[PDB]
Amino acid sequence: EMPQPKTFGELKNLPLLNTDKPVQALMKIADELGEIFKFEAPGRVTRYLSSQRLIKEACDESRFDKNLSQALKFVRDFAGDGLFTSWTHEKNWKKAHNILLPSFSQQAMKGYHAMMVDIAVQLVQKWERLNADEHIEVPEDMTRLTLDTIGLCGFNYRFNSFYRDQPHPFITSMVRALDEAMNKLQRANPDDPAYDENKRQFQEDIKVMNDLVDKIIADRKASGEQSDDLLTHMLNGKDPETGEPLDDENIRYQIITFLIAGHETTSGLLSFALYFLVKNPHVLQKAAEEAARVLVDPVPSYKQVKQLKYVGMVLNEALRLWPTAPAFSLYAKEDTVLGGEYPLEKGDELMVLIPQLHRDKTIWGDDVEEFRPERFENPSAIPQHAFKPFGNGQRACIGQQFALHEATLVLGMMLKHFDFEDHTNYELDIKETLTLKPEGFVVKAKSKKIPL
Amino acid sequence: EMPQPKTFGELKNLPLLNTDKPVQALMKIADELGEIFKFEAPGRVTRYLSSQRLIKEACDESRFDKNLSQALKFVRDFAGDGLFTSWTHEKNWKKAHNILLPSFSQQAMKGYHAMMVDIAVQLVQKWERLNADEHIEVPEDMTRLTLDTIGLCGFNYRFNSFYRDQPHPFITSMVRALDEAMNKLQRANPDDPAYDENKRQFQEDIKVMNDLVDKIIADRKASGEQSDDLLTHMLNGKDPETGEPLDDENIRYQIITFLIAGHETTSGLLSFALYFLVKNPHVLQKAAEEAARVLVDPVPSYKQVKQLKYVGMVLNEALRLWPTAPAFSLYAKEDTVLGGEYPLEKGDELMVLIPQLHRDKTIWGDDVEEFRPERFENPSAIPQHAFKPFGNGQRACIGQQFALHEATLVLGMMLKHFDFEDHTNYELDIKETLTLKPEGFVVKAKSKKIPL
Ligand code: HEM
Ligand code: HEM
Ligand SMILES: CCCCCCCCCCCCCCCC(=O)N[C@@H](CCO)C(=O)O
Numbered sequence: 001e002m003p004q005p006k007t008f009g010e011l012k013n014l015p016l017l018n019t020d021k022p023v024q025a026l027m028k029i030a031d032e033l034g035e036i037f038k039f040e041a042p043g044r045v046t047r048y049l050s051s052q053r054l055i056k057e058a059c060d061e062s063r064f065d066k067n068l069s070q071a072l073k074f075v076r077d078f079a080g081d082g083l084f085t086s087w088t089h090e091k092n093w094k095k096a097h098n099i100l101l102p103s104f105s106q107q108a109m110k111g112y113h114a115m116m117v118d119i120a121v122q123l124v125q126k127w128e129r130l131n132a133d134e135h136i137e138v139p140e141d142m143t144r145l146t147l148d149t150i151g152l153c154g155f156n157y158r159f160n161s162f163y164r165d166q167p168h169p170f171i172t173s174m175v176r177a178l179d180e181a182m183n184k185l186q187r188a189n190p191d192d193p194a195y196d197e198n199k200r201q202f203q204e205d206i207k208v209m210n211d212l213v214d215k216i217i218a219d220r221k222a223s224g225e226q227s228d229d230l231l232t233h234m235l236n237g238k239d240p241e242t243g244e245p246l247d248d249e250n251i252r253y254q255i256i257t258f259l260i261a262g263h264e265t266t267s268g269l270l271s272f273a274l275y276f277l278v279k280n281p282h283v284l285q286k287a288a289e290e291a292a293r294v295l296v297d298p299v300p301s302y303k304q305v306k307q308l309k310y311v312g313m314v315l316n317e318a319l320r321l322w323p324t325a326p327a328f329s330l331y332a333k334e335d336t337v338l339g340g341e342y343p344l345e346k347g348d349e350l351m352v353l354i355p356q357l358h359r360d361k362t363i364w365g366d367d368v369e370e371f372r373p374e375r376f377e378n379p380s381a382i383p384q385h386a387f388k389p390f391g392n393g394q395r396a397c398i399g400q401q402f403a404l405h406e407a408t409l410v411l412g413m414m415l416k417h418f419d420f421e422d423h424t425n426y427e428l429d430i431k432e433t434l435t436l437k438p439e440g441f442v443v444k445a446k447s448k449k450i451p452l
Numbered sequence: 453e454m455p456q457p458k459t460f461g462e463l464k465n466l467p468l469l470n471t472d473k474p475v476q477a478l479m480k481i482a483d484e485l486g487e488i489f490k491f492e493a494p495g496r497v498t499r500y501l502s503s504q505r506l507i508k509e510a511c512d513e514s515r516f517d518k519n520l521s522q523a524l525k526f527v528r529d530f531a532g533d534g535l536f537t538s539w540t541h542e543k544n545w546k547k548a549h550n551i552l553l554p555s556f557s558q559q560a561m562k563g564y565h566a567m568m569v570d571i572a573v574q575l576v577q578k579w580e581r582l583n584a585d586e587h588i589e590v591p592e593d594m595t596r597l598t599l600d601t602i603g604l605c606g607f608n609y610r611f612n613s614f615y616r617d618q619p620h621p622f623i624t625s626m627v628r629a630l631d632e633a634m635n636k637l638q639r640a641n642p643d644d645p646a647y648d649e650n651k652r653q654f655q656e657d658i659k660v661m662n663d664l665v666d667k668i669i670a671d672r673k674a675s676g677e678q679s680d681d682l683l684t685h686m687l688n689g690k691d692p693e694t695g696e697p698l699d700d701e702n703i704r705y706q707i708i709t710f711l712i713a714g715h716e717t718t719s720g721l722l723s724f725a726l727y728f729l730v731k732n733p734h735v736l737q738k739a740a741e742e743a744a745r746v747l748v749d750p751v752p753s754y755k756q757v758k759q760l761k762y763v764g765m766v767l768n769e770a771l772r773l774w775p776t777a778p779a780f781s782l783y784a785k786e787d788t789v790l791g792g793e794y795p796l797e798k799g800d801e802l803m804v805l806i807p808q809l810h811r812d813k814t815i816w817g818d819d820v821e822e823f824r825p826e827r828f829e830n831p832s833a834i835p836q837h838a839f840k841p842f843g844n845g846q847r848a849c850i851g852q853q854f855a856l857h858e859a860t861l862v863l864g865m866m867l868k869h870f871d872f873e874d875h876t877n878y879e880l881d882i883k884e885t886l887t888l889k890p891e892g893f894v895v896k897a898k899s900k901k902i903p904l
């Protein structure tokens with residue numbers, strides 16, 4: 001009854017993941033097979049969902065809970081029972097959720113604004129200081145900005161990424177760890193000795209990330225300054241339910257979790273948004289007119305960023321086409337029938353293929369490939385479970401407002417301060433590291449010569 | 453130091469309550485004066501609190517206990533030492549609390565469900581049987597439903613409100629008693645002979661309510677049916693702490709208390725929720741889609757009502773904007789400093805202005821007047837003591853789960869069975885009877901023709 005892509009004998013569908021672009025491969029399979037398909041590997045099965053019709057059922061928290069995909073099981077080798085890679089039923093999930101949600105309160109967000117501006121001004125100064133006909137490496141600079149922003153706002157720690165021509169060592173190790181997790185998805189026999197070098201390199205990259213976590217904890221312990229940031233809540237906050245704080249082992253996992261989850265996908269978002277703006281110059285002009293009208297002061301105020309409505313619509317439309325954490329996994333809490341057609345047993349898994357949900361013509365209309373921010377004129381018009389770049393329910397993204405405030409601030413400043421040229425007529429090439437990001441995307445930025 | 457609204461010479465602030473909308477007047481004063489203001493009358497003072505930062509301190513049960521506001525001292529003339537109008541230190545408060553808490557257990561709620569459906573089906577049948585272009589009197593029908601539900605579930609007594617074109621006589625007397633309590637708030641000389649007719653009518657209304665209580669007790673005493681409801685617990689239950697049952701005098705006060713507290717505010721909630729739904733059609737679409745997807749049987753089950761997450765979020769957002777028991781009062785157990793700024797002496801009174809707490813932009817963001825159920829999509833994101841429609845601590849609403857189960861069931865069935873039209877473009881007009889409810893709110897309901 002359920003469609004299934006092509007098989008490879010006893011390897012079933014597993015060789016379909018032998019690609020550097022597995023999510024894009026699964027999107028093409030969804031276009032061929034429709035709203036649901038079965039995906040089998042030796043010893044495993046999951047079902048990929050692409051329609052709002054089925055995903056609205058998958059998002060019913062009475063029926064389905066967050067599952068760890070194979071990807072997240074591999075990421076858990078370094079992120080442990082941090083928020084992203086914990087099961088809902090592990091005591092540390094609800095404890096850390098309750099302890100860290102206050103770090104994303106409206107008061108906390110206003111508190112982060114000045115440090116977001118510190119890093120955004122470093123980006124604008126970098127681009128102001130370029131010589132004639134020099135270009136910008138877009139995803140590279142967006143990763144400099146977003147890593148520095150979570151480091152400073154979250155941990156009062158300066159990665160100083162704009163002082164480096166090479167990616168930050170933490171980034172080199174994170175990307176190689178994410179790429180190893182993604183490459184491991186196709187491995188039939190991961191304990192074959194052919195993967196011993198992969199395992200060694202993975203452990204080395206995990207140690208690089210943990211050495212930096214050690215430095216952040218040591219810097220806070222040695223600090224004479226009074227901080228009130230995400231790390232303050234990790235070290236001091238008590239869960240109202242249990243009355244307990246986090247232990248040291250869980251805090252280390254939360255720091256690695258927030259450094260990764262708290263920047264990589266925001267770098268992707270900013271990169272895709274600038275891509276779509278240079279490919280749609282009338283949209284760029286509309287966004288630049290709003291930035292010039294609203295951002296009347298040398299640096300943006302908190303309230304001014306909240307008033308960048310069209311910049312927000314541009315970011316939402318970029319998340320519609322290329323949600324940068326492009327899937328999430330669920331399991332059936334109990335036996336249930338999906339869509340009146342597909343009986344599931346307790347424990348059966350689903351994968352939500354977010355880029356395909358976001359191309360559901362029954363929700364968005366036939367023009368789903370067009371970049372049209374005006375779809376989000378009134379975001380309330382979008383049905384439940386139709387636009388899900390931040391996941392679902394109590395396991396939804398804790399950082400959504402942080403990410404959108406940062407991205408809106410930075411894109412607003414970029415559009416205020418520069419005109420942009422797609423000088424190479426760049427062909428979109430989406431690199432996969434579990435997360436999605438344009439690769440090789442370069443532009444030229446001509447200063448409007450507006451002082452900071 | 454403390455702000456204070458305008459004065460009337462020796463009457464101080466008392467004539468500010470000479471209005472049929474005193475809570476709405478106090479909300480406007482809070483908007484003008486901010487998080488705290490003094491309110492003086494001849495011989496008394498209280499302080500109105502509107503900010504989460506001060507209300508979280510007021511909600512510290514080590515520092516403050518429930519006070520009887522002037523409103524509750526007047527209601528105590530008929531509700532005595534029932535749960536709502538008892539002091540925490542009166543023996544009958546903890547005794548009745550321990551005897552009746554089990555009547556609001558999950559097991560009790562599953563037991564009430566069928567009788568809630570009996571009344572909900574009567575509402576749906578009434579609206580199905582209307583002719584073309586007839587309309588619904590919303591608060592009137594919600595009062596028919598909620599009074600009948602507490603009567604049947606609580607006391608196995610049928611008010612038969614859907615058999616009446618006029619309000620039930622118990623409602624006429626209750627509303628006139630609550631209106632008298634509210635009107636008495638402004639009286640500098642309550643024993644002036646000008647109020648002799650007010651006093652006579654108040655006593656008549658109290659007698660109507662007590663005659664109905666007599667009938668309920670007599671009907672149970674004469675019954676050949678074995679009930680296990682709220683009245684069973686009042687008449688037979690022993691407090692585990694003292695080992696004592698309630699005496700006859702306290703039982704009479706509890707029955708009056710539960711008939712009033714157990715329906716009026718739920719009628720308000722349902723009326724405000726339907727108001728917000730017809731004013732926010734995208735929210736109505738989301739709630740109606742959930743009702744259709746979840747309520748797959750002609751008779752909703754207990755489990756299906758628990759599954760209506762979005763309907764629950766609608767109800768919580770209605771309670772955010774218009775909490776239908778809109779204030780509660782506290783006194784200082786000992787000398788203490790509120791908010792590091794306002795010294796209080798033992799016995800000093802506070803009023804918590806719940807609608808203003810719920811508009812605290814430091815908690816909710818600047819868009820506080822917008823109806824957005826999605827504020828409640830991630831429950832732990834609501835800060836401690838930011839959302840208090842059911843009061844605080846051991847003196848919180850005993851009936852919260854009953855009210856929300858009833859309202860979720862009924863609103864779910866309404867949205868399953870009908871489309872709604874705001875055919876008059878109704879202008880919100882909030883009637884005050886201590887409690888709040890829309891007045892004159894009418895809609896048209898077009899049947900979806902789904903059988904019961
Ligand atoms: C545009 C940027 C972002 C996107 C697209 C994004 C996307 C997501 C998605 C889809 C999930 C759900 C994962 C699943 O169910 O497996 C998630 C969870 C999470 N995200 Fe984000 N995220 C972004 C930014 C952020 C930021 C900036 C932070 C931190 C400051 C953050 C922290 C987290 C955490 C901790 C979780 C786990 C929450 C839980 O289950 O308790 N994310 N994110
Ligand atoms: C949406 C509906 C309701 C709202 C907004 C509401 C609100 C409240 C509030 C604010 C208080 C505390 C007042 C104070 O501190 O002076 C309270 C107390 C109380 N409520 Fe409710 N109520 C609702 C429904 C119900 C129902 C359905 C019942 C009974 C079935 C009920 C029974 C009581 C009782 C008995 C108390 C006194 C509790 C005691 O202090 O021990 N309420 N309610
Ligand atoms: C520590 C913080 C974590 C940040 C990592 C975020 C990663 C977000 C994206 C995860 C989804 C990527 C899915 C990859 C494609 C896929 O469909 N995988 C399935 C393959 C079926 O086995 C799986 O992992 O079973």
Ligand SMILES: CCCCCCCCCCCCCCCC(=O)N[C@@H](CCO)C(=O)O
Nearest residue numbers: 521522523531536709712713777778779886
């Ligand atoms: C028996 C069951 C009880 C039903 C009663 C529910 C009523 C709940 C709402 C009570 C709050 C009404 C506040 C009225 C406005 C106000 O602020 N009153 C102050 C005025 C200052 O004296 C007061 O009563 O001092």
